Amino acid sequence: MDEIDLRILKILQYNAKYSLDEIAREIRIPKSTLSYRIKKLEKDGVIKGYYAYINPASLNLDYIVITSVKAKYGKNYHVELGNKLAQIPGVWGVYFVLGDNDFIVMARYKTREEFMEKFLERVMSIPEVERTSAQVVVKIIKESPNIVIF
Amino acid sequence: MDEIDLRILKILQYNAKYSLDEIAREIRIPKSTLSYRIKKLEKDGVIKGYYAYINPASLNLDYIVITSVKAKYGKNYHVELGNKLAQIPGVWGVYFVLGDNDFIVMARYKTREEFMEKFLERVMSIPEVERTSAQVVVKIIKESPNIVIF
Amino acid sequence: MDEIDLRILKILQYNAKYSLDEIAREIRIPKSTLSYRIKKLEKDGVIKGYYAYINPASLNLDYIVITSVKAKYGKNYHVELGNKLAQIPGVWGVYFVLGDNDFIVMARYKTREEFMEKFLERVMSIPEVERTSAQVVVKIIKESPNIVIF
Amino acid sequence: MDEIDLRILKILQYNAKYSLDEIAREIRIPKSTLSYRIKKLEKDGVIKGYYAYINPASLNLDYIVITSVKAKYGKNYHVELGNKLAQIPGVWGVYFVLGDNDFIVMARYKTREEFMEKFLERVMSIPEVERTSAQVVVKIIKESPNIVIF
Amino acid sequence: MDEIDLRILKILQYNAKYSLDEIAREIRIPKSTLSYRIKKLEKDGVIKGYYAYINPASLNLDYIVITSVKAKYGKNYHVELGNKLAQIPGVWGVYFVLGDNDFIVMARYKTREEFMEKFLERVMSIPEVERTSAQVVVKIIKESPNIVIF
Amino acid sequence: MDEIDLRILKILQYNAKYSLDEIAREIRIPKSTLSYRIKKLEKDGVIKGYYAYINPASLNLDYIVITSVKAKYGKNYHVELGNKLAQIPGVWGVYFVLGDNDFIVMARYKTREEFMEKFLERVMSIPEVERTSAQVVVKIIKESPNIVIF
Amino acid sequence: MDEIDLRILKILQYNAKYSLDEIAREIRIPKSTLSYRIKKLEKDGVIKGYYAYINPASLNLDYIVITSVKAKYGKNYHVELGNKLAQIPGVWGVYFVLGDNDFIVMARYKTREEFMEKFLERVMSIPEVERTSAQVVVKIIKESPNIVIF
Amino acid sequence: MDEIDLRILKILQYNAKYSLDEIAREIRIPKSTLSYRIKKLEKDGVIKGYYAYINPASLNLDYIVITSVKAKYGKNYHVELGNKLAQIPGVWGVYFVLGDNDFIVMARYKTREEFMEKFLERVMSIPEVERTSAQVVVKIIKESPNIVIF
Ligand SMILES: NC(=O)CC[C@H](N)C(=O)O
Ligand SMILES: NC(=O)CC[C@H](N)C(=O)O
Ligand SMILES: NC(=O)CC[C@H](N)C(=O)O
Ligand SMILES: NC(=O)CC[C@H](N)C(=O)O
Ligand SMILES: NC(=O)CC[C@H](N)C(=O)O
Ligand SMILES: NC(=O)CC[C@H](N)C(=O)O
Ligand SMILES: NC(=O)CC[C@H](N)C(=O)O
Ligand SMILES: NC(=O)CC[C@H](N)C(=O)O
Ligand SMILES: [Mg+2]
Ligand SMILES: [Mg+2]
Ligand SMILES: [Mg+2]
Ligand SMILES: [Mg+2]
């Protein structure tokens, strides 16, 4: 990867729906070269794919909660818990964090009931779970994980 | 939005690079109808855009940290802090959470030095900040914010 | 329910001992209509009943305590604990709260001894209880759960 | 107050809509005596009034939250804060608790927005407030403050 | 007990080595009456005994520590733990406290080694103990438990 | 101080009301020697005095509370706070503890009101106080500060 | 040990590579005496040895972490855990601390992966471990354990 | 640096008092080469110096404490505090840690008094200090910061 690639990625991370011609005219290089560079970035896994950015509000994903999970030490219990947490519907992010030493889980649902039935009641029964603490999001000031190049 | 739209969105949230023909053959509807439905979803803001999903590791975004920020009460100091946090380079997520009552900040950097210079040292000088606590991510089990339809 | 009902409920939540005539003269509607509307609110369960508001001090309910209960995760142990907590004499409120993720219990007794014997010693032996923390109320600034319409 | 009064209060705390005749037949005393005893209990302030018990769900009071408030020490700042908290719409209970040494606030709203606008944003600007912590109620197992005699 | 008794107790709590004549001349009553009143206070257990107040420093009781003990819930485990804590040499005070809901233990030793061997290592092996936290006293500003009448 | 002194102190810490003859017969030494040794222990300040041990219950000292006080750093504010805490009526013990780094205050009162008026409301107004936390004693398992020799 | 020894130790703790002649000229004593005094300090174990001070940065020891370990009470489990912690590669310091009552572990590694594999994953499986909390060092302001004489 | 250097450093970190001949015979290389390699390691700053390892117990460094310091946010106040902490006599280690976000201070003294006078009372007056918490070391299981190569 060279500086040309960064300029390309810095544009695609925002809008992957530009024409090659428009991107070409912006970074000043042949469309054949641009097209070539994009293809290989994909091949080398720098670009893992293209997604449609859907507004969660539009799906009534109103009940947003960030949960901290403390796991029961022993083996084993740890990684095992990470994977059980990641397969719960509505959970889009699971992180093993230092600190505190436990898991941070990002999940979205339409209502309280849904959250309770799909997330809460389910996590309550997992064996390897010592204790959890939820932090309800009342306001999203920013959420742009797509922006990796500042 | 009807069930047909959900089927469309459930595919686009994964791969927005399918051909209309392939999506049409999958959900069984005229390409003209599919194309029409997608265009309006965009118009109604359900689909806010299309992004290239870039692998953070490929950019050496190694120092991942989740920071909790406690703000000084008064006015005012609150929203003000949210916006100052959101404009810091490397910060992609800022949430005002209940709970705890404070802000959860998601940020990525290549190294410790970068994190310290771009995030730490900067947050340390913000007036409205009472105290912060960082939780270093040592392992990402899952990160797919693009998946809104389970 | 319409605005007329709200005006009625806003009065009954305070004093259910007014005459229909007095309420009628206040909201300007036939007593037969008022009487009809009240009867159906009761039928539809909006009005669950009428209670006498008794001053707790008059019964020497001096030892007021708000207890937080952390439950042992597994199944099951959760709901089970909620119900065991709710049947303890002197306990009038039990809430499953997010946050913290555990139960908030409101209880009143005449003395410390009573509290210890009826609440403390009993909760100490419940299997599903991990740990509890009590917050003694030294002053009630306000307690009007009857007011649902502000 | 004698044991006869307790039997009366133990019934009125449940249903203040019984006929004097029915209560009389239950506790075995002249209706004139019963009527007399009730009148004086009211006079001596044991019975402060009669309320209609309204189902909060019926009013869409969905966003229930228990907030802990830590106050800035000095004077003065304390009682002052108690009263400012008690006059906020939606707040039905405010307690000064030992423990922890701070205030426990019970409040109900229809939604998150309402809670934020009526409670959150307002408490954030109060001078005497050091910090707050909210515990969202996801389930009410029991709420019968009307029951003072077990 | 009357006001005369309080005047007597208020003197004896300080110095039980005054002559009856000197106390008599101070509160203005016959020595026979004073002597009589003291004898009965002892009989009724108001005065449980007379002790020599020994300076702990003089015994090299240098390592003073206040320990909080969290007990494992179940039965039973509670009171049982209180008594095991009270029989440990060097422990002069054990309190079951609300709050926090656990035990506060006051203990004095000559050195760190002694504290570790007599208290620490011993408490570490008690079954009913969940966890403990010690607060080392680096300065005694006041310690006059003998003063009950202010 | 020699072993003979310890034997003497070990008896006086319990009951200072024994006759010299009885103590003499117990440790096997001339009454003149015993009397001499006691006199000098007093002179050297090993024995600071003799007190009457009064049962706190007998004075209705029912509201027992152990308070932790966090002080505002600066100078100065520290020692200053220790002394202000020690002169509050009902406070018999004040300790500066490591740990936690703050003050542990032992106080007794007859009721909640007294505690609030004499202790609470007073500490709330002290400038150098950052925050406090009270732990209500619901049971005294042991309180024998008079025993310094085990 | 006398003041002459302190002067010697105060120099050797800094630079053990001075010539005896240079140290002799500094403290003003015969080289034979100096040499004699050093030899015996070593014999009496005051001087346990001479080490080369290696810069950790030069070995890419970048991931520095201070971990707090809470142990499961019972016996036994305690000391046992101390020794298991001390034999983990990369761990140079293990302390049993009061306070908090648990272990403080100092460890250094080159990267996050190394830390996770050599420390984290290993501690996660130790039976006697209740829970741990890591504090990542982002800046070493000072680290001179070699300086014992100030 | 090559593997030969590591073998050399791995020996010098333990005992810098071996003869070049003995080290040469161990790693199998000419003494002239060994001597050359050591000289340059020193020049490149890999080896910063040679110290005498002094037993702290031998100096009666009995009062060992690990203190956590929370600093007042603003500027500036941060680094400033780090340096003020590092110049306090008895303090050998100061670390700025993530986590928690504050400073970890390692200090040793002979007694409690010394600790209070040299460390405590001094830190209490520093302006930029919000609060501190001390963890008394009652047992050093391991302390070998000199070992950088495992
Ligand atoms: N986009 C462009 O201008 C490139 C045109 C074409 N790829 C070429 O050969 O230059
Ligand atoms: N994709 C399709 O088969 C649709 C074809 C075209 N839109 C039509 O008129 O049917
Ligand atoms: N309260 C009233 O005035 C109503 C009277 C009666 N219900 C009617 O027919 O109007
Ligand atoms: N409720 C009753 O039976 C009482 C009747 C009436 N008060 C009487 O004189 O007895
Ligand atoms: N102390 C006194 O003066 C009392 C003297 C004696 N008890 C009497 O009969 O008065
Ligand atoms: N208590 C005694 O027996 C001592 C008596 C007296 N002091 C003596 O000269 O021995
Ligand atoms: N370093 C010195 O000057 C000491 C010399 C030699 N040890 C002597 O006999 O004095
Ligand atoms: N230590 C050794 O054997 C090395 C000897 C000498 N440096 C040489 O020329 O080989
Ligand atoms: Mg994307
Ligand atoms: Mg009611
Ligand atoms: Mg006494
Ligand atoms: Mg060294």
Pick A112's closest partner by Cβ from D115, D120, D138: D138
Both H38 and H98 in a single domain? no
Parent domain of B61: 53-150
A47 and A58 belong to one structural domain: no
For residues C84 and C136, membership in a common domain is answered with: yes
Across the A/G interface, how many CB contacts are shorter than 8 Å? Answer: 28
Cα C106 to middle of ligand 10, angstroms: 16
Residues 6+ apart with CB under 8 A from G43: none
Task: Count up the domains in chain G and report the number.
Answer: 2
Contact F130, E95 (CB under 8 A): no
DSSP G28-95: T--HHHHHHHHHHHHHTTSEEEEEEEE-GGGGT--EEEEEEEEEPPBTBHHHHHHHHHHTSTTEEEEE
Contacts of residue E57, Cβ cutoff 8 Å, sequence gap at least 6:
none
Q: Which of E31, E34, E36 to mutate to test the pocket of ligand 5 (most atoms within 8 A of CB)?
A: E31
Tokens standing for residue C12: 């009954």
Q: Is-contact E138 H112, C-beta < 8 A?
A: yes
Q: What's the gap in Å between the CA of C77 and the closest CA on chain A?
A: 9
Q: Provide the 8-state DSSP code for C62.
A: -
CB of D146 within 8 Å of any CB in chain F? Answer: no
Residue G2, judged by CB atoms within 10 A of its CB (0-12, 13-18, 19+), counts as exposed
Answer whether D91's CB lies under 8 Å from D107's CB.
Answer: yes
How close, in Å, is residue D1 to chain C by CA atoms? 9
Q: Which residues share a beta bridge with B65?
A: B107, B136
Which residues approach ligand 7 with their CB closer than 6 A? G 21, 24, 30-32
Give Cα separations from E100 to A85, B59, D96, D135, E97 (angstroms). Answer: 32, 48, 17, 18, 7
D chain contacts of residue F129, beta-carbon cutoff 8 Å: 73
Put simply, whether D16 touches B (Cβ < 8 Å) is: no
Examine the domain organization and report whether C105 and C65 are in the same domain.
Answer: yes
Does an H or E element contain H141, and which?
strand H129-143
Cα C30 from Cα C45, distance rounded (Å):
23
Q: Please tell me the distance from the alpha carbon of residue D16 to that of residue D8, in angstroms, as a whole number.
A: 10
Same domain, H14 and H37: yes
Here the tokens at position G48 are 């346990």
H76-84: list long-range contacts, CB under 8 Å, 24+ apart.
H76/B124, H76/B125, H77/B124, H77/H127, H77/H128, H78/B124, H78/H128, H80/H128, H81/H126, H81/H128, H81/H129, H82/G139, H82/G141, H83/G141, H84/H126, H84/H128
Nearest CA to ligand 2 atom 1: B31
Atom number in ligand 8 closest to CA H21: 1
Please name the residues in contact with C3: beta carbons below 8 A apart, sequence gap of 6 or more: none
Give the ranges where C1-150 is alpha helix by DSSP (H).
3-12, 20-27, 31-43, 77-86, 112-114, 121-123
Within a 10 A sphere around the Cβ of D52, how many other Cβ atoms? 26
**Interface size between D and F, measured as CB pairs under 8 A:** 28
Ligand 1 atom closest to residue A24's alpha carbon, by position in its atom list:
1
E136 Cα: distance to centroid of ligand 11 (angstroms): 24
What are the phi and psi torsion angles at F35 (to 5°)? -55, -40
- D8/D77 same-domain check: no
Tokens of G15: 């630079």
**Could you give the CA distance from residue A3 to residue H36 in angstroms, rounded to a whole number?**
43
| Same-domain status, E10 and E59 | no
Number of Cβ within 10 Å of residue C10's Cβ equals: 15
Cβ density class G127-148: b for 16+ within 10 Å, e for less: ebbbbbbbbbbbbebbbbbbbb
Which positions ≥6 away from H57 have C-beta within 8 Å? none
d(CA C145, CA H112): 54
Question: Rg for chain D (alpha carbons), in Å?
Answer: 20
The H-assigned helical ranges of chain D are 3-12, 20-27, 31-43, 77-86, 112-114, 121-123
Q: Are A68 and B112 in contact (CB under 8 A)?
A: no
Distance CA D60, CA G78 (A): 54
Q: Report the distance separating Cα D27 and Cα G24, nearest Å.
A: 105
Written as one string, the DSSP assignment of chain B is --HHHHHHHHHHTT-TTS-HHHHHHHHT--HHHHHHHHHHHHHTTSEEEEEEEE-GGGGT--EEEEEEEEEPPBTBHHHHHHHHHHTSTTEEEEEEETTTTEEEEEEEESSHHHIIIIIIHHHTT-TTEEEEEEEEEEEEEEE-TT----
- List the single residue in E with minimal CA-CA distance to D98: E99
Q: Using CB atoms within 10 A of its CB, is residue B84 exposed (0-12), middle (13-18) or buried (19+)?
A: middle
A61 and A92 Cβ atoms separated by less than 8 Å: no
CB atoms within 10 A of CB G114: 18
Q: What's the token pair of residue A42?
A: 């994909």
* H helical segments located in chain A: 3-12, 20-27, 31-43, 77-86, 112-114, 121-123
CB B97 within 8 A of CB A138: yes
Contact present, F115 and D77 (Cβ < 8 Å): no
Q: Which numbered atom of ligand 2 lies nearest the CA of B20?
A: 1
CA distance B104 to B98: 10
CA E100/CA E105 separation, integer angstroms = 14
Q: Could you tell me the CATH number of the domain that includes residue B3? A: 1.10.10.10
Contacts of H145 (CB under 8 A, 6+ apart): G92, G93, G106, G143, G145
* Coil vs helix vs strand at C53: strand
Residues 6 or more apart in contact with residue F31 via CB below 8 angstroms = F20, F21, F24
Closest CA–CA distance from residue B115 to any residue of chain G (Å) = 10
> CA dihedral in degrees (H85, H90, H94, H99; nearest 10)?
-100
Do H89 and H133 lie in one domain? The reply is yes
Interchain contact G101–F (C-beta under 8 A): no
Which value, to the nearest 10 degrees, does the dihedral of the CA atoms of residues E38, E43, E44, E45 take? 90
**D18: number of Cβ within 10 Å:** 14
Q: Are residues A81 and A115 in the same domain?
A: yes
E78/E8 same-domain check? no
Residues near ligand 1 (Cβ within 6 A): A 21, 24, 30-32
List, in sequence order, every residue forming a beta bridge with D50; answer none if it has no partner. C52
Which residue is associated with the tokens 């009487």?
C35
Residue D121 CA to residue B45 CA, distance in Å, equals: 29
Q: Do B126 and H73 touch (CB under 8 A)?
A: yes
Which chain E residues touch D98 with a CB distance below 8 Å? 98-99
Q: Whose CA is nearest to atom 1 of ligand 5?
A: E31
Neighbours of D88 (CB within 10 A): 16
Residues with CB under 6 A from ligand 3: C 21, 24, 30-32
Q: Which of F4, F31, F34 to mutate to test the pocket of ligand 6 (most atoms within 8 A of CB)?
A: F31
* Long-range contacts (CB closer than 8 Å, 24 or more residues apart) made by G115-122: G115/B138, G115/G63, G115/G65, G115/G90, G116/B138, G116/B139, G118/G88, G118/G89, G118/G90, G119/G65, G119/G67, G119/G88, G119/G90, G119/G91, G120/B138, G122/G88
- Measure the CA–CA gap between H74 and H128, rounded to whole angstroms: 9
Q: Does the beta carbon of E21 sit less than 6 angstroms from any atom of ligand 5?
A: yes
Tell me which residue has its CA closest to atom 1 in ligand 6.
F31
Q: β-pairing, E91-97 with F129-143?
A: antiparallel
Q: Is the dihedral of CA C11, C15, C19, C22 positive or negative?
A: negative
Whether residues E33 and E61 fall in one domain: no
Cα separation, B139 vs E150, in Å, equals 61
Positive or negative: CA dihedral B6, B10, B11, B15: positive
CA distance B137 to D77: 41
What separation in Å is there between the alpha carbon of H95 and the centre of ligand 4? 84
Token code pair at residue G116? 């996770």
Q: E25: Cβ–Cβ under 8 A, 6 or more apart, which residues?
A: none
Q: Are D62 and D45 found together in one domain?
A: no
Q: Are F70 and F126 in contact (CB under 8 A)?
A: no
F38: closest CA among F5, F11, F15? F5
Nearest to C98 among D1, D15, D138 (CB): D138
Pairing of strands C63-71, C47-54: unpaired
* Other CB atoms within 10 A of residue D76 CB: 14
* CB contact set of A30 (below 8 Å; sequence gap of 6+): A24
Alpha carbon of residue F47 to chain centroid: 15
G27 and chain H in contact, CB less than 8 A: no
The Cα–Cα gap between B48 and B27 comes to 22
Which chain F residue's Cα is nearest to H70?
F73
F27 lines ligand 6 (CB under 6 A): no
User: Which two three-digit tokens encode residue F104?
Assistant: 């542990």
Distance, in Å, from the CA atom of F28 to the CA atom of D51, rounded to the nearest integer, reads: 80
This structure's resolution (Å) is: 2.3
List, in sequence order, every residue forming a beta bridge with A143; answer none if it has no partner: B93
Query: Smallest Cα–Cα separation from H103: which of H64, H130, H139, H74?
Result: H130
The CATH number that applies at residue D122 is: 3.30.70.920
CA distances from G107 to A73, G87, G145, H55 (A): 20, 11, 15, 21
